[PDB]
């Protein structure tokens, strides 16, 4: 079981919207009850998705109402995190954690343009 990231590094503009990608292999119909997905960065929980249901009560303050997972695309083996209105605090190492059968994690480094 290997989770794959198409991009090692995002460089984003201040105030933009971004969508970072995580691929994980699915075979032919997602078994939602077996899927576990966490998006975090380095003490902070962004997404908690365990055995088919989300729990945002775990989400950190920084990302409140701003970052969300896109659920229809889970069918495609795609776990995409969607960060709205990026700022310089969102810069940092992000990490995807996916368990479906086996489990793996990948890191992605993010840089945010100064204004202008």
């Amino acid at each position: 079981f290997t989770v794959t990231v198409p991009k090692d590094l995002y460089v984003v503009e201040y105030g933009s919207n971004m969508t970072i990608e995580c691929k994980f292999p699915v075979e032919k119909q997602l078994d939602l009850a077996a899927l576990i997905v966490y998006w975090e960065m380095e003490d902070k929980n962004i997404i908690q998705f365990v055995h088919g249901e989300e729990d945002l009560k775990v989400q950190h303050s920084s990302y409140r109402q701003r970052a969300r997972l896109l659920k229809d695309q889970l069918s495609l083996g795609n776990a995409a995190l969607q960060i709205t209105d990026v700022k310089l605090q969102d810069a940092g190492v992000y990490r995807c954690m996916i368990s479906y059968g086996g489990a793996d994690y990948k890191r992605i480094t993010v840089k945010v343009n100064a204004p202008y």
Partner: antibody
Framework: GQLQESGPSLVKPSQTLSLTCTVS????????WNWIRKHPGKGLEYIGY???????YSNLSLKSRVTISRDTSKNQYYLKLSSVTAADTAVYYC????????????WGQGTLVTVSS | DIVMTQSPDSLAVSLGERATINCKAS??????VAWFQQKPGQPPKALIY???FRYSGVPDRFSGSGSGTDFTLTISSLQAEDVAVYFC?????????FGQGTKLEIKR
């Protein structure tokens, strides 16, 4: 470090089992704080964890009835298991692991909890 | 879940001899397997992780092996103090699961 579980030894059926694990030593900073139980005549069952990020995981076999939480200001984390039955009589272990994909490598002594009228 | 089936349920070995405890995964785990020892009235004690490498302090006679789905703990030069229940854990995927354990008895 050193983990020490506490709470009632007896809980009536249909109530909620509440337990506490007091975390000391090196384990305070370990990344994942787990709960494990062992029903008599059955293998060990992994219950779930709470992470240094505040994130939780719970076994699908139990997810409905389980709530894991923490209080870092007291160096504790808790387990609440609702609507308990005789199947939930078990020795309940708290335990730590270094990472998200590492073995459960330090165990507490475990505490027996019986469900009975 | 990934079911971890241990074999045997129990074994009796003489002192100084060798005991073999198998743990079989229901799907590829490739080496995310740990071994534990639990002496009576004591908490489990980590022996091996990544399925052949010992933890610090664990004596030399405890050797783990295997990869894929077949894993084996070998205890050589068996000592009286080796009486315990030995069990495996997989951390390849969630939920983590354990073998049901093998009870090692000393023959004398």
């Amino acid at each position: 470090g050193q983990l020490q579980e506490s709470g009632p030894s007896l809980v009536k059926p249909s109530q909620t089992l509440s337990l506490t694990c007091t975390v000391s030593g090196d384990s305070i900073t370990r990344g994942y704080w787990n709960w494990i139980r062992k029903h008599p005549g059955k293998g060990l069952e992994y219950i779930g964890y709470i992470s240094y990020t505040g994130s939780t995981y719970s076994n699908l076999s139990l997810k409905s009835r389980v709530t894991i939480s923490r209080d870092t200001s007291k160096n504790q984390y808790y387990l609440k298991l609702s609507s308990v039955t005789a199947a939930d009589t078990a020795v309940y272990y708290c335990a730590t692991s270094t990472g998200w994909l590492d073995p459960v490598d330090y165990w507490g002594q475990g505490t027996l909890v019986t469900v009975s009228s | 879940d990934i079911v971890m089936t241990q074999s045997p349920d129990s074994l009796a070995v003489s002192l100084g001899e060798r005991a073999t405890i198998n743990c079989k995964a229901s799907q590829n785990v490739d080496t995310s397997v740990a071994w534990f020892q639990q002496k009576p009235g004591q908490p489990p004690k980590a022996l091996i992780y990544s399925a052949s490498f010992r933890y610090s302090g664990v004596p030399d006679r405890f050797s783990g092996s295997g990869s894929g789905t077949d894993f084996t703990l070998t205890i050589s030069s068996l000592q009286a103090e080796d009486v315990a229940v030995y069990f495996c854990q997989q951390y390849y995927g969630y939920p983590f699961t354990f073998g049901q354990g093998t009870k090692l008895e000393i023959k004398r």
